[PDB]
């Protein structure tokens, strides 16, 4: 039974690579983080920074979340991210993803003690 903080780590952290280097990155990573068990998760972003740097965003720029809550924070600097999005031809259990690498600010929602990211809201 996964904690919110651990679910964020599993779904969104990939510190082992600096960037997505191939078109199949999302296919491989969505499968290995168990995001295609029982259904194809339609959209998911991976962050290629250290966990410490992502946790530090909870002390950066406080902004509104898309849902209206006020516990979201925007990173001061851009970060290396990979957006993974199901293609139109994807259908469970043969999930298929488009891989888009970018450098953008991240917006996360933070909660708890310690105060850590629990939701990925957007990137800018
Ligand atoms: Cl898992
Ligand atoms: Cl996401
Ligand atoms: Cl401010
Ligand atoms: Na938690």
From Swiss-Prot:
Top-level enzyme category: lyase
Documented effect of changing residue 12 to A: Loss of activity
Localisation: Secreted
Reactions performed catalytically: an [RNA] containing cytidine + H2O = an [RNA]-3'-cytidine-3'-phosphate + a 5'-hydroxy-ribonucleotide-3'-[RNA]; an [RNA] containing uridine + H2O = an [RNA]-3'-uridine-3'-phosphate + a 5'-hydroxy-ribonucleotide-3'-[RNA]
Highest taxon listed in the record's lineage: Eukaryota
Residues forming the catalytic site: 12 (proton acceptor), 119 (proton donor)
Intrachain S-S bonds: 26-84, 40-95, 58-110, 65-72
Annotated residues for binding of substrate: 7, 10, 41-45, 66, 85
Keywords for this protein: Disulfide bond, Endonuclease, Glycation, Glycoprotein, Hydrolase, Lyase, Nuclease, Secreted, Signal
EC number: 4.6.1.18
Gene Ontology cellular-component terms listed: extracellular region
Keyword Nuclease: yes
GO process annotations (BP): defense response to Gram-positive bacterium
Keyword match Lyase: yes
MF-aspect GO terms: lyase activity; nucleic acid binding; ribonuclease A activity; RNA nuclease activity
Sugar attachment sites: 1, 7, 34, 37, 41
Tissues expressing this chain: Pancreas.
Main function: Endonuclease that catalyzes the cleavage of RNA on the 3' side of pyrimidine nucleotides. Acts on single-stranded and double-stranded RNA.
Family indicated by similarity: Belongs to the pancreatic ribonuclease family.
Assembly information from the UniProt record: Interacts with and forms tight 1:1 complexes with RNH1. Dimerization of two such complexes may occur. Interaction with RNH1 inhibits this protein. Monomer.
Name the UniProt record assigns to this protein: Ribonuclease pancreatic
Boundaries of the shown chain within the full protein: 27 to 150 of 150
């Amino acid at each position: 039974k996964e904690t919110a903080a651990a679910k964020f780590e599993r779904q969104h952290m990939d510190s082992s690579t600096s960037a997505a280097s191939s078109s199949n990155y999302c296919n491989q990573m969505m499968k290995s983080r168990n995001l295609t068990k029982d259904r194809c998760k339609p959209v998911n972003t991976f962050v290629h920074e250290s966990l410490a740097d992502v946790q530090a965003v909870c002390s950066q720029k406080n902004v509104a979340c898309k849902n209206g809550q006020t516990n979201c924070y925007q990173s001061y600097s851009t970060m290396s991210i990979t957006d993974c999005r199901e293609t139109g031809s994807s259908k469970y259990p043969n999930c298929a993803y488009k891989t888009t690498q970018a450098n953008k600010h991240i917006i996360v929602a933070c909660e708890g003690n310690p105060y850590v990211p629990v939701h990925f809201d957007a990137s800018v």
